[model samples]
Target: MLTEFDAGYGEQPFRDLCANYPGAEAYDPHDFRIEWGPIFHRGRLDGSARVLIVGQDPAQHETIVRRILVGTAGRRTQGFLAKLGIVQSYVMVNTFLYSVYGQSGGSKHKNEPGIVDYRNKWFKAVLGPGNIEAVVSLGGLADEAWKAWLKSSDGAAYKTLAYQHITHPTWPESSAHDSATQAANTKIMLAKWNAALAALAPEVKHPDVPTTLVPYGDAFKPSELVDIIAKDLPAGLPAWMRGDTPWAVRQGVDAAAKRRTIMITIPDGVIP
Candidate 1:
């Protein structure tokens, strides 16, 4: 049930590619947190998302990639989406399940099997039907995982899952710069990434997007916010930065508790 792409760059024998995946027979599940990877997001998803991006585990490499400022080439793909001003109304774990490969003193490896299971469950219980408009695979691993998983479902609802492959952001830059073969691979991968986006968002005629997010901010000047260790507060703190004072009396404490409990049990601010 796999499709072949004979674009001349090389053959993508998925069957063979999968066979090379390292065996997991000896790996321990408990010591690994691949099952408990970190998920960071800024918005809520309630079926309003027009695009979906999938990456392999929160590998150490991928974690740093996500935090990169939006305008950098590393975030080029995300930058394009932000320009559409499209709110991502949905987000979910893209993998089937996470894996942990080792005991103490060993690093974990999350492979394709884990992600495949994640997507299937997510689609059935969360995305339901027609909820996902587009899906962008962050790298070759992600793309293959999606395709393989969809095959198991007889390509039902997943037929709508538009697929794209992008070069891993951490793909060696030197290889991309000097080797024609490497360069071609990078170009083709990026092209697939764009094609996937176009198919998902056909209304976009020409996506003149910055490679990253910096230019979109109001000030148009990107800045990093890092904590600096210091003994005392700076000479002048903004008045708005002051901390709130809490009431300490027993009456105040009792009243606060009653208010909290009543607020939860009461639907005064809730709409039916």
Candidate 2:
């Protein structure tokens, strides 16, 4: 028996794009986590992608894996894609290359020319192949990112493409402290997500696996939590890196120290 795998960004254009990405000028160190370097993207960089996802930014797990959207938020979004039958025929990129340091950082620089300009290049590179049938923007910032792209010359061409701007996966958690409020918010978000899924399902003519359109409930079901596949990661990454239990965090006594530190521990079962 043989196993299928992703070769990663070995082809032209994508290779060049990765080699030359915007640095501190576009992503301010004070606002964005430039110290952790930039986590470019995850999923297919090849022409096989049918859907393109625009996320907000990198997080602790993303920092370690060097791939955007690999944590709780990522798994939820992955399940969303699964609803559309897009098992592996998708690619994801963030609004900013680095993790957002401050709460206002993303909104403050959402319209920055330097950031938008560099991100558009990636949009063009990924969408240029023309295989992308649908586009999904997560959260308000991601919605703005897509709208900004639409203003560009390259972006103008894809104006007619299928698109949906959904709530961020962790919105329920971030918006409310109490369990009851969180539950209410989850219902609201899931209803919105269901609407988006209904709109996108037909648009995605090609999916890795042909799945029926199953809308999410008020809360996420255990079955929906899919792990990030091996192909979506960089070479030499441990399988535990994609597991559900978190193993990465930014720890420090003060703000400055926390900003500079990301502690990663191996998962418990890895040694057994």
Candidate 3:
């Protein structure tokens, strides 16, 4: 079976961006999980991009995939992009390179010069020329990430770009302990996403599908949660790694051990 995949960061600015990334000095070890190393981004670097996504940071799934936003957050964001008729013409980056260590770590380190400066470099690199028509930032810190960029001399140029700040994809789960509350929170968040979709739909002049916009209901439909595609991942990665089923997980007896461990198990039926 023949399949297409990402050739990776071999091109100009992306090649340089990938080659040089901020490390532990730029990202505080206490506030960020610098041990996992840095995961750059996902999607087009060949300049076909029309939408820019600013996400929070990498997690277990992202650590394994070597691409930001490849987990549940990624799938949901993919659905959002699909709504905008952008199937493969989008570029993504996180507010931070590593996972935020604590619940409030991202907030605590919001304006760190090192983090913001490095992230802004990515913003400058991706928002090249006029291809990017809109930008969406996931969650609160992501919003701040965009705002920080705007405050910069370089970022001031795109102040007029179409933008929106939506709830993080997993906010419901993180905010609620009970399933019922999670459902209610999800309904609220989806409504907000719908509003952002409506506002940005008119702005996205170029789209891959170019269909009529469909606002979300109270809850997310299964169809709305699209799977991450192979082309978004590193070349030679198995397709099963990108499947919807959760696979990679952090397993350890203590916090330190957990920080050091990422257990990846092949999901059932992949081999059988």
Candidate 4:
């Protein structure tokens, strides 16, 4: 169940959308059922992250979630923030409040009018007050939804939320490419993502590795969004890499070699 702050969402336009969710139907203190009813983490409660990462929802497998939030992905993200000295600077949250597996999946993708109501209301109520500086939409749905909604309303508060499209960690292969491709794309994305972030919130410098607020360049799965980030990375890298170890030295190569490698690799074919 969401905290008192978010629970009151039962009233007004959000009511219909809230009905679709099961609301802690099978919570067990011993097991990992944090997927429902406003999953909370100390990370969300505190952290003054100037950057916010907005994804669709929790993974379908509940057992792995608690671990994901605390393990590699979680630690990597938070650790990156900390290393960059921005641990107290950002927050990570999702667009949908819960893991919409099983029956819940239907209502979520349906975009029922009520679902939109719930989303808009929640962002305004819960996320807005959280003092989110910017929003990084994890995939297409969350990205398009925020974009469409922001345009529909006055979006005064949204001025702080700069939307960046990122590759969905989980997606069908045919839609984009295989997972291997995605992983490679993620690293490229991180290089570019940090630049956009730096422009939006220039105070913090980029970390050696991409943080959760940013992204691990090698972790993201391939998607059209990922490609966009990949395209912009080189230009972005200079800004973050400035004043640090020389790019060639970091990669154990000279500047010419670095350029040849990054510039020479052709994706599908050599253009005529």
Models, CA RMSD each = 18.3, 1.5, 1.0, 16.9
Q: What lDDT would each prediction earn against the true structure?
A: 0.38, 0.88, 0.90, 0.42
Candidate 2 colliding pairs: none
- Judging by lDDT, tell me the better candidate of 1 and 2: 2
Clashes of 1: 12
- Which model scores highest in lDDT? 3
Which ranking of candidates, highest lDDT first? Answer: 3, 2, 4, 1
Measured against the true structure, the TM-scores of the candidates, in listed sequence, are: 0.45, 0.96, 0.97, 0.48
Q: Per-residue alpha-carbon lDDT of model 4 for 1-272, expressed as tens digits?
A: 21111122334434544465433333221222243345322133332345555555553221222211322233334433443445444545455554443432333343545445555654554454546655666566667667656765645557555556655544423245777775566566566556555554443443233444443344433221211111111222222121111122112177434322321122232244
Q: Which ten residues in a row have the lowest lDDT in candidate 2?
A: 1-10
User: Please, what are the lDDT tens digits per residue for candidate 1 over residues 1-272?
Assistant: 33221121122332332233222333334433333333322122344444555654443222222221111232344344554434233232333223322223232333445434434544453345455565666555566656765777645657655555655544545355666666666565445545554554554322334223222222112222111111111234221111121111112256334222211122233334
lDDT of 3 by residue, 1-272 (tens): 77878888888888888889988788988888888889998999888999999999899999988998888889999999999998999999999899999775578878888889988988998887679999999998899989989998999999999999999999999998999999999999999999999999999999999879988999999989998887888778988788888989999999878888989998899897
Tell me the spans in candidate 4 whose CA falls farther than 4 Å from its real position.
1-42, 45-49, 60-73, 79-84, 100-110, 127-130, 152-156, 169-183, 203-272
Native-to-model Cα distance after best TM-score fit, residue 27 in candidate 4, in Å: 18
To one decimal, what is the Cα RMSD in angstroms of model 4 from the true structure?
16.9
State the RMSD for candidate 1. 18.3
Which residue pairs clash in candidate 3?
none
